[PDB]
Amino acid sequence: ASSFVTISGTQFNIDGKVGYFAGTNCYWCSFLTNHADVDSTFSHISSSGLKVVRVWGFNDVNTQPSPGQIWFQKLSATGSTINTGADGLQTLDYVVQSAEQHNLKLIIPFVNNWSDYGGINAYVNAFGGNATTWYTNTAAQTQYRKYVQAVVSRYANSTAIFAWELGNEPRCNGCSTDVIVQWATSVSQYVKSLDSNHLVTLGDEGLGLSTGDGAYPYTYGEGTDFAKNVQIKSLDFGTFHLYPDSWGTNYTWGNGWIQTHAAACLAAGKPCVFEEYGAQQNPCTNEAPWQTTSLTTRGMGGDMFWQWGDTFANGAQSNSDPYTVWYNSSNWQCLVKNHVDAIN
Numbered sequence: 001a002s003s004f005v006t007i008s009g010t011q012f013n014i015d016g017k018v019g020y021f022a023g024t025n026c027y028w029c030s031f032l033t034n035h036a037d038v039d040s041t042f043s044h045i046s047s048s049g050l051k052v053v054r055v056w057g058f059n060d061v062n063t064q065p066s067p068g069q070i071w072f073q074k075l076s077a078t079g080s081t082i083n084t085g086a087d088g089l090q091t092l093d094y095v096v097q098s099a100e101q102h103n104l105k106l107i108i109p110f111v112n113n114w115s116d117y118g119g120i121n122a123y124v125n126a127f128g129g130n131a132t133t134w135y136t137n138t139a140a141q142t143q144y145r146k147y148v149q150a151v152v153s154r155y156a157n158s159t160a161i162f163a164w165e166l167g168n169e170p171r172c173n174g175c176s177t178d179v180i181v182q183w184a185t186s187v188s189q190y191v192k193s194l195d196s197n198h199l200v201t202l203g204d205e206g207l208g209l210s211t212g213d214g215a216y217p218y219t220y221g222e223g224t225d226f227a228k229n230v231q232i233k234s235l236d237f238g239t240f241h242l243y244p245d246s247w248g249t250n251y252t253w254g255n256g257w258i259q260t261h262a263a264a265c266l267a268a269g270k271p272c273v274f275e276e277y278g279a280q281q282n283p284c285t286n287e288a289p290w291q292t293t294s295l296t297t298r299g300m301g302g303d304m305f306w307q308w309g310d311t312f313a314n315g316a317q318s319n320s321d322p323y324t325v326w327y328n329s330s331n332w333q334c335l336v337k338n339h340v341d342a343i344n
């Protein structure tokens with residue numbers, strides 16, 4: 001079957017099947033200009049047994065790029081432009097087309113917390129203030145909502161959308177945690193006013209949760225309170241990410257990070273998605289146990305490793321980083337095929 005992705009009890013219902021899912025992150029999929037590269041990458045993800053792919057829904061610039069370069073939105077104080085051209089949201093249109101074709105569903109965030117592909121920084125450059133006043137900067141929010149509408153309206157009736165995502169890892173460094181609560185409440189309500197077919201999620205890392213061991217990620221220094229955010233009515237499921245290497249914690253501490261988040265989700269009556277995770281050292285040994293913890297913990301509805309790597313018909317490889325798991329590699333065997341086999 002096909003149909004819209006929904007929540008059934010505390011699990012996801014994908015194409016009529018209720019149950020745990022595995023997926024992956026492929027931010028770079030959105031920016032592929034050769035259609036054949038999207039298709040081969042998506043054929044590999046689908047043949048691996050993964051059901052969901054996380055792709056950027058943004059590509060923000062302050063200056064128009066060199067002709068032919070991809071850009072989805074140009075942020076300016078004197079009038080912003082949303083690019084619906086061939087070098088614009090038409091590349092995201094094909095990603096959605098290919099997902100429909102390959103039986104995949106997509107998680108699509110609307111703006112980056114980080115300056116990669118512009119992010120909140122690009123809005124700051126156009127509209128003033130800074131990274132934390134962004135959330136309540138009227139001109140910035142007005143353009144952000146116009147972009148939301150430009151993306152959402154394209155795919156609202158597509159069955160390929162798993163969920164709309166407010167942003168990639170939104171933080172408000174040192175802010176009261178209410179700044180994000182209010183912003184998320186308002187934006188998620190707006191998203192729901194545009195599309196009543198699809199799920200909506202925050203896209204936060206999960207920071208701020210008092211049931212843990214007091215390490216920094218559990219503290220409230222980044223303006224987010226996980227339990228508060230996940231109780232927002234217009235958000236259907238929680239998201240949380242995990243990077244011990246960037247956070248100063250060891251790898252095995254990741255198990256408790258999953259468990260606490262899963263409990264918080266279930267306490268709010270909703271599923272959690274373990275949406276990004278990676279380990280730079282020995283990923284097979286350090287990440288396999290996280291996969292098993294998520295698969296075996298009540299309240300977890302699925303997990304998406306950070307990040308797919310693949311290669312194209314012309315010999316070019318995809319964008320990558322130290323976390324990339326290359327299709328068909330040893331780590332693909334360990335972290336993809338063996339995990340997918342275990343879900344069966």
Ligand SMILES: *[C@@H]1O[C@H](CO)[C@@H](O)[C@H](O)[C@H]1NC(C)=O
Binds near residue numbers: 131133
């Ligand atoms: C951001 O702007 C607000 C309001 O001026 C200010 O209170 C806060 O200190 C600023 N942040 C930084 C990091 O300068």
Ligand SMILES: *[C@@H]1O[C@H](CO)[C@@H](O)[C@H](O)[C@H]1NC(C)=O
Binds near residue numbers: 157194197
């Ligand atoms: C598309 O989805 C909206 C709900 O978000 C619904 O109101 C509308 O009828 C659908 N469009 C078509 C053409 O079915």
Ligand SMILES: *[C@@H]1O[C@H](CO)[C@@H](O)[C@H](O)[C@H]1NC(C)=O
Binds near residue numbers: 213250253
């Ligand atoms: C890692 O961290 C926890 C404390 O968070 C500690 O109890 C455990 O012994 C440590 N494990 C390794 C392998 O370092």
Ligand SMILES: *[C@@H]1O[C@H](CO)[C@@H](O)[C@H](O)[C@H]1NC(C)=O
Binds near residue numbers: 328
């Ligand atoms: C992946 O691996 C199999 C060998 O297991 C091979 O048949 C196929 O060509 C490979 N696909 C790619 C993209 O290399």
